[PDB]
Amino acid sequence: ADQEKLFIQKLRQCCVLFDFVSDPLSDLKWKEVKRAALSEMVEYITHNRNVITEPIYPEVVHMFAVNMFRTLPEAAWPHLQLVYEFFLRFLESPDFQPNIAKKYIDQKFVLQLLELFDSEDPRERDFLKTTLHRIYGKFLGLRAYIRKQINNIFYRFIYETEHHNGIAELLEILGSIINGFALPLKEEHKIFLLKVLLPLHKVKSLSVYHPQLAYCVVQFLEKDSTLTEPVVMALLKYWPKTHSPKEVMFLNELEEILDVIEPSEFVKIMEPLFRQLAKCVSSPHFQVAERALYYWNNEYIMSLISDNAAKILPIMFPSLYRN
Amino acid sequence: KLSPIIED
């Protein structure tokens, strides 16, 4: 269709990976041609209507695969960024039809996409995060495979000691998934929370992805509040027995839990929690104590304490109160 | 922040 033909031509043109190690002038020329070709199509697919036809889909997916599905160790990032931006605009288009795209965006594609999450470039991981989040939401028949494959990446790292650079981004995607769970939480999701999310707190590199991890845990509790006890107890279990600045994170996570905790569930764990909180106030590390003392500023926590002061106050101030 | 994804 003339313009469809040119679109496909330019897409395929961006599948030629060149290098002139003996001609810097020709190399920059080719790079710019490719950069311009991508830029044109980015603008073209973004602002034009009804340009994504059925024959376009395999060309876009192939162009992405040829360019992105590479081996890791980039320097030629302005090229990769354009491919990411184009493919995202492709996925996000109002004319995008998953029923057509599901043929080319499959499990092998998703799996290869996930392998890129181990990239050391934060910019790339960010694009992959947005991309996979889009793919997950658009393709129902991949959600199960995606969940399991993310599960596998997590079941590694923790146990298999297979370090991963994209744990944060993946958890951020998961947080988006958890927030939209169906009313009775499937057992598979409960199993995941208790057997994967919680043990993630014991890993040494927790600092890198802790805010994302905490959000997932909190979101899990805003869904089914009955999961409060095994979470808090595990968090108290994975709590640093050595007084360390790492405690502030747990205190951040714990207060964020208390902000969404139900009173009936608060009672179940208020004693071991505040026994730990009391230790934090007594901490040799000022940062830890300062963070723990900030709990009293929370009005909802105060509500829970004031209506349970008979058992909590003797724990926080044993010299001033008794049972 | 990523937009929520309703489960099916």
UniProtKB/Swiss-Prot annotation, chain A:
Tissue specificity: Highest levels in heart, skeletal muscle and brain. Lower levels in pancreas, kidney, lung and placenta. Very low levels in liver.
Record's subcellular location: Nucleus; Chromosome, Centromere
Residues included from the entire protein: 36 to 377 of 524
Listed GO CC annotations: chromosome, centromeric region; cytosol; Golgi apparatus; nucleoplasm; nucleus; protein phosphatase type 2A complex
Example GO BP: signal transduction
Superkingdom of origin organism: Eukaryota
UniProt protein name: Serine/threonine-protein phosphatase 2A 56 kDa regulatory subunit gamma isoform
Annotated source species: Homo sapiens (Human)
Disulphide linkage map: none
Lineage of origin: Eukaryota, Metazoa, Chordata, Craniata, Vertebrata
Post-translational modifications reported in the UniProt record: Isoform Gamma-3 is phosphorylated on serine residues. Isoform Gamma-1 phosphorylation by ERK2 is IER3-dependent and inhibits ERK dephosphorylation by PP2A-PPP2R5C.
Description of what induces expression: Up-regulated upon DNA damage.
GO function terms (MF aspect): protein phosphatase activator activity; protein phosphatase regulator activity
